[PDB]
Amino acid sequence: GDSYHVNARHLLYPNCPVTRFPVPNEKVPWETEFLIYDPPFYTAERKDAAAMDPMGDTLEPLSTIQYNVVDGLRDRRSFHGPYTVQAGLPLNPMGRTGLRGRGSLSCFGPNHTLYPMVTRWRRNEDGAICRKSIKKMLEVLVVKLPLSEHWALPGGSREPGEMLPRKLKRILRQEHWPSFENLLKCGMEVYKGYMDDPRNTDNAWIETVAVSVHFQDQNDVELNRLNSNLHACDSGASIRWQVVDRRIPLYANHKTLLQKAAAEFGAHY
């Protein structure tokens, strides 16, 4: 239970490097005990403290809009159970990180994401598995962020006004492809639950829904021409398929959820 915030308790954040309340490994959840000491509550990083004109989340004194209901213009709803708004600020089940009331995650608690887990068991020049030990060899299209030193999977994290995989349509479709809209329709669901995002505070924390489109057949895979289209001409820098191993530039990110993918399909990871 101490693995709530191992990325969120980082000191340097490249948006807003504020960290000045570490919370111990024996005292990670705020529900049992975090400390009696407290951090401040101000990051906001872009527009406003709690008004947030392009990201209409909620104010703090204009109280939260009853997390269970379908409140309006932004669903912060969860696959988690306790979305605890306590003092007008939504305290997480993962414990107070000691951070400062982040709205820079564009939701004040975006508690749903879905990464384009395109599951293709890789094969050799004529067809094989990981003879590494016994397991399978897995390859996944991940997309390199052009400025940051990591690759990335675009979260299906509910663009404001749009549904879930339409923030995965920040880049899934701009590489010009208006045809195939049946992504999770041929998909197999994997995991629901928390991911330790590094910008997670008590008042903001991110979790996932994971869906696999298993291309074990390896012949009618979705490609640049077959069944999909990704040019990487205007919004894609490096969109290469990547093989599973435990260093690849997905460091404190999406890689930390693909071990359940390797347990599902028998991949080497």
Binding site: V6, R9, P22, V23, P24, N25, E26, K27, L35, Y37
Partner: peptide, 12 residues
């Protein structure tokens, strides 16, 4: 102070 808070700075 922050003695219990210093334990995580060793335990990581």
């Amino acid at each position: 102070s922050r003695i219990v808070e210093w334990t995580k700075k060793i335990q990581d």
